[PDB]
Amino acid sequence: PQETLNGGITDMLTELANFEKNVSQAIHKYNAYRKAASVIAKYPHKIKSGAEAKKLPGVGTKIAEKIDEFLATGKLRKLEKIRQDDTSSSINFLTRVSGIGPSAARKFVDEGIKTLEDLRKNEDKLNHHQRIGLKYFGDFEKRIPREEMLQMQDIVLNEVKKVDSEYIATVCGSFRRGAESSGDMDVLLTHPSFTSESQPKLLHQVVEQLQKVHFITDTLSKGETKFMGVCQLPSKNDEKEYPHRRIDIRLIPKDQYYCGVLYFTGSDIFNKNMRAHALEKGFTINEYTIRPLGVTGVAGEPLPVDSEKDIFDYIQWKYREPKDRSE
DNA sequence: CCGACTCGCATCAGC
DNA sequence: GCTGATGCGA
DNA sequence: GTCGG
Ligand code: NA
Ligand code: NA
Numbered sequence A: 001p002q003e004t005l006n007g008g009i010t011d012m013l014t015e016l017a018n019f020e021k022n023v024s025q026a027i028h029k030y031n032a033y034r035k036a037a038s039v040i041a042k043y044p045h046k047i048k049s050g051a052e053a054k055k056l057p058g059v060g061t062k063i064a065e066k067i068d069e070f071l072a073t074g075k076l077r078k079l080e081k082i083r084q085d086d087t088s089s090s091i092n093f094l095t096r097v098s099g100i101g102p103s104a105a106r107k108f109v110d111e112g113i114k115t116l117e118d119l120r121k122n123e124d125k126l127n128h129h130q131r132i133g134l135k136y137f138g139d140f141e142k143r144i145p146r147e148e149m150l151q152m153q154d155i156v157l158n159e160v161k162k163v164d165s166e167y168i169a170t171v172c173g174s175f176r177r178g179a180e181s182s183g184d185m186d187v188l189l190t191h192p193s194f195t196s197e198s199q200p201k202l203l204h205q206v207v208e209q210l211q212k213v214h215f216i217t218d219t220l221s222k223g224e225t226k227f228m229g230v231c232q233l234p235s236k237n238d239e240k241e242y243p244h245r246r247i248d249i250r251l252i253p254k255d256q257y258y259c260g261v262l263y264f265t266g267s268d269i270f271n272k273n274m275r276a277h278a279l280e281k282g283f284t285i286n287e288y289t290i291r292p293l294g295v296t297g298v299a300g301e302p303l304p305v306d307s308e309k310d311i312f313d314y315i316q317w318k319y320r321e322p323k324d325r326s327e
Numbered sequence B: 001c002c003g004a005c006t007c008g009c010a011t012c013a014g015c
Numbered sequence C: 001g002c003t004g005a006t007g008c009g010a
Numbered sequence D: 001g002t003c004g005g
Helices: A003-022 A027-041 A050-054 A061-073 A077-083 A086-094 A102-110 A116-121 A128-135 A146-163 A202-212 A254-265 A268-280 A308-314
Strands: A168-171 A185-190 A216-222 A226-231 A245-251 A283-285 A290-292
Touching: A003 A027, A003 A061, A003 A077, A003 A086, A003 A102, A050 A061, A077 A086, A086 A102, A116 A128, A128 A216, A146 A168, A146 A185, A146 A202, A185 A202, A185 A254, A202 A216, A202 A226, A202 A245, A254 A308, A268 A283
Parallel strands: A185 A245
Antiparallel strands: A168 A185, A216 A226, A226 A245, A283 A290
16 A cells, blocks of 8 residues: 555554553554554555554554544644653663663663763663664664665675585575565574584684674674674775664574574564464474374474475475565 | 564673 | 672564 | 454
8 A cells, every 4th residue: 555545554553662661661552553554554545534544453443533633633642742742752762772771761861861972971880782772772773675685685694604515594574584674684594413302612713703704793682593783884895885784693403494584584474374274284383393283282293394395295285485474 | 563674792680 | 709680682 | 453263
């Protein structure tokens, strides 16, 4: 649907969602508004009334009333008010800094720290993650065109194989589904030496090499199985420097690898659909495994999986190409 | 009427 | 010092 | 806030 159809409504609901998450700290109300925003964004008609929208799954009485007010007035009194609220708008804004959630935003604003400038003046009140998020505030809100993602993939796959040619690496997310742009890079990594029933340095090796060739620039968090950090393509010639990008790297045991690939390939809606159809067939699918359900409901031991296709097969489904996986 | 809506890592709260 | 809870982002 | 047991 064209944005101009119900964009005013969906924008309204999305903004309400953010204030619930960031100010009221009501995560379930936050997801409630988003679900309403999503289902309305997919609605192929311009909504004439709240009663019309209430027919959609996820839109209840309260949102129906809000839509009635928005349609009749072009705004929402409650939204208009919280917009001009200095405390609430500042709390909501500060959460745009990676590492600053609803709680940290509240505490900062409570003691008079409201803007990026205020943040820049009080660095010693920020933890390591928050300083990085502050440093790359602008870059982290930029999207990544696919050509840059492709070049990022080149470096990752090359350096990973250089460390150990027996590594297996897959760039997932929307990029694997063939998207024109990405919000970040999500790399899934495994090695034949690493299983569920199984060195605790396989991830470090790869991270270290990507640091050595100056691809990885910063580290947000790093353990034995999960890395979260910052990277940057090398600058061409005398061209303008590339934005710094968010990159995650996960080490997954061989026997759980392809369940992970599927899950982190998405999309969420596709994964939702697929999980629903998994159930009726008598299988349970999560990030790690696909399991067989006993006659009451007792899940037996995880089924052997050696590819994405294996999973699709178990539930008597035919392989859907990553490009065909938005639903 | 009222409960539902996973986990790795960094850091806090408390012993 | 360690264990468990919480915040955060995914 | 919405859904549903
Ligand atoms: Na509804
Ligand atoms: Na944040």
